[PDB]
Design a binder for this molecule. Structure first.
Ligand SMILES: CC(=O)NCCCCOc1ccc(NC(=O)Nc2ccc(S(N)(=O)=O)cc2)cc1
Ligand SMILES: [Zn+2]
Length: 257
């Protein structure tokens, strides 16, 4: 039922999901001058060498690459986190044009897109349990700007034609998510939520300062996806981002000076 249109979009979500008006919703605007450098924050540990991708799916809101999360292979640790978080899936949010698409903003600047690498805390055993906990998930957010192509994204781009409409999926094995990461792991962090229903307040957000560059041709391929199922009117999957939400009583911390 929920979506990104006039009648079912973000301004409507609170009716089915009242937590939409909660105390720790995401995304937020990152005011770079107000974020406090925190010298106690550790370097982020991203260990993706043994990642096992499984499938790629058009779920009607994004496309989603799923990983085998049944063992500690691809894990996120350190940074602001306590313990070990397993990589579950990644997906993107993007715009109709290059000047919008990101969920987080940086001094009100919107990027063309935002990549979410979604991890869950192994101390809760499974993602369904983890989403019921305030420290259950860690999402690594990476901004996309348009310029030079990202070679490590091309394998993703080249299969989107096969999952054009809602409910389509395909085999997507041997994808290496290290190819999606920028040089620097400098980050901002804050406590927040899922940015799609059920908007659960279970996420430690880790947003990298350095965007990746993707080509116009790569992002155009995102914008050829459809929100609709094949038996419904064609509606391009664009502008699948939630706008910035009130920061309320939260502090954004920087890992860097
Ligand atoms: C062993 C095996 O074969 N495992 C394979 C996975 C099975 C479970 O699959 C899954 C896959 C996905 C989910 N839910 C989500 O990820 N919700 C979510 C919503 C919004 C955000 S964000 N980033 O704020 O926009 C992040 C996460 C649950 C179970
Ligand atoms: Zn997301």
């Amino acid at each position: 039922h929920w979506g990104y249109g006039k009648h079912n979009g973000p301004e409507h979500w609170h009716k089915d999901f009242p937590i939409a008006k909660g105390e720790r919703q995401s995304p937020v605007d990152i005011d770079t001058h107000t974020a406090k450098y925190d010298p106690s924050l550790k370097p982020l540990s991203v260990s993706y060498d043994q990642a096992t991708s499984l499938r790629i799916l058009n779920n009607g809101h994004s496309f989603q690459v799923t990983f085998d999360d049944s063992q500690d292979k691809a894990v996120l640790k350190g940074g602001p986190l306590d313990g070990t978080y397993r990589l579950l899936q990644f997906h993107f949010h993007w715009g109709s044009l290059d000047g919008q698409g990101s969920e987080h903003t940086v001094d009100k600047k919107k990027y063309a897109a935002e990549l979410h690498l979604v991890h869950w805390n192994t101390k809760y055993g499974d993602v369904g349990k983890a989403v019921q906990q305030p420290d259950g998930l860690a999402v690594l957010g990476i901004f996309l700007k348009v310029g030079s192509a990202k070679p490590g994204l091309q394998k993703v781009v080249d299969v989107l034609d096969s999952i054009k409409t809602e409910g389509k999926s395909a085999d997507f094995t041997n994808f290496d998510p290290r190819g999606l990461l920028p040089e620097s792991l400098d980050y901002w962090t804050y406590p927040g939520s899922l940015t799609t229903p059920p908007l659960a307040e279970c996420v430690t957000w880790i947003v990298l300062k350095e965007p990746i560059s993707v080509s116009s041709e790569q992002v155009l391929k995102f914008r050829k996806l459809n929100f609709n199922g094949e038996g419904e009117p064609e509606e391009l999957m664009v502008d699948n981002w939630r706008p910035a939400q009130p920061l309320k009583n939260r502090q954004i911390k920087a890992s860097f000076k």
